[PDB]
């Protein structure tokens, strides 16, 4: 496989929507590479529309847990949890290609049943939102309330705007 | 496979609609070949109706990043983003077979929901249109105003017209 060939160079490819399967696989690669060489940096290539919050957090927590610094590169599009993971790359090592797109918004979900059940679901998603936004705040330099305001609606940003926002550190120009 | 054999010769096959799966595959191959030899040119054969704008830009951005000059060959049909990638080939290294076809037009998309949501989708697709048209004018040498008027509706061109327009450099024959 071509991807297995990239893995040998410590490059992990996140190029699809994020679900438990993708998360479990990426978590595995991160642990693997961390074992191969806990010193060597790891590069996470991201081109995904995002996906599951819990799956995304599983990847996030693993990136933080391992010793190797994880660089993130936005290719094509890093949306929602994909953008969250892009912004979670080692500080100073978060990149984007010149015409890449980065989009941030709020968590999506649903609730059906009794007022009580709907309340439980509502409380959870709002809690998940705050949890994500606090991290984004820390990662970008924007205060929580600004992250909140700016993610109320789908917020698409160019590479330049993402840099200005604090989501990435550098654009791979030329 | 028969393509693995072509890869050995530094030939990348873009013979299907462009989606994230394809784009990521092409990106890997591009990085692989540039790694194998950052000097020798790379050939990107294109027979595609196009596809996702972001997936397309990911391929485009990679072609621009790598040291190896990337030639492009339109076989059969290069439409929409496929036509964009064709025109993005190393200047002077853009080819098309005699009965090949090239088509350019504007981005396609959708928007459903509240007025505010529709507006967000509209602003984005319009920005993409400008971004793509700007590059097309640079690659073809055609003034922006012409690119805008000429991509208003589906614009099909023969290998001859594509050459006259500045989308390709030479038409293969014998």
């Amino acid at each position: 496989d071509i991807y297995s060939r990239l893995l040998k160079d410590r490059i992990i490819m996140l190029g699809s929507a994020i679900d438990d399967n993708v998360a479990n696989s990426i978590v595995s690669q991160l642990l693997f590479l961390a074992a191969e060489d806990p010193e060597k940096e790891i590069s996470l290539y991201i081109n995904s529309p995002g996906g599951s919050i819990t799956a995304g957090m599983a990847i996030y927590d693993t990136m933080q847990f391992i010793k190797p610094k994880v660089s993130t590169i936005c290719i094509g599009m890093a949306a929602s949890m994909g953008a969250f993971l892009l912004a979670a790359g080692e500080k100073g090592k978060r990149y984007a290609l010149p015409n890449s797109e980065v989009m941030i918004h709020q968590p999506l979900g649903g609730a059906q049943g009794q007022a009580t059940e709907i309340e439980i679901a509502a409380k959870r998603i709002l809690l998940l939102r705050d949890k994500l936004n606090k991290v984004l705040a820390e990662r970008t330099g924007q205060p929580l309330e600004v992250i909140e305001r700016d993610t109320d609606r789908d917020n698409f940003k160019s590479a330049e705007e993402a840099l200005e926002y604090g989501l990435i550190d550098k654009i791979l120009t030329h | 496979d028969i393509y693995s054999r072509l890869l050995k010769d530094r030939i990348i096959m873009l013979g299907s609609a462009i989606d994230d799966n394809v784009a990521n595959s092409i990106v890997s191959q591009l990085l692989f070949l540039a790694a194998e030899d950052p000097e020798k040119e790379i050939s990107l054969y294109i027979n595609s109706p196009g596809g996702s704008i972001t997936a397309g830009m990911a391929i485009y951005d990679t072609m621009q990043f790598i040291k190896p000059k990337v030639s492009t060959i339109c076989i059969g049909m290069a439409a929409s983003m496929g036509a964009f990638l064709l025109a993005a080939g190393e200047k002077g290294k853009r080819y098309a077979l005699p009965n090949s076809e090239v088509m350019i037009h504007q981005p396609l998309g959708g928007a459903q929901g509240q007025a505010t949501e529709i507006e967000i989708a509209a602003k984005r697709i319009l920005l993409l249109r400008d971004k793509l048209n700007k590059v097309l004018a640079e690659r073809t040498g055609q003034p922006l105003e012409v690119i805008e008027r000429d991509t208003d509706r589906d614009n099909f061109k023969s290998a001859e017209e594509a050459l006259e327009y500045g989308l390709i450099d030479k038409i293969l024959t014998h």
Binding site: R10, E41, S43, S71, I73, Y95 | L31, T62, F65
Partner: peptide, 6 residues
């Protein structure tokens, strides 16, 4: 995609 990731 090096310089610098690898």
């Amino acid at each position: 995609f090096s310089p610098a990731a690898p």
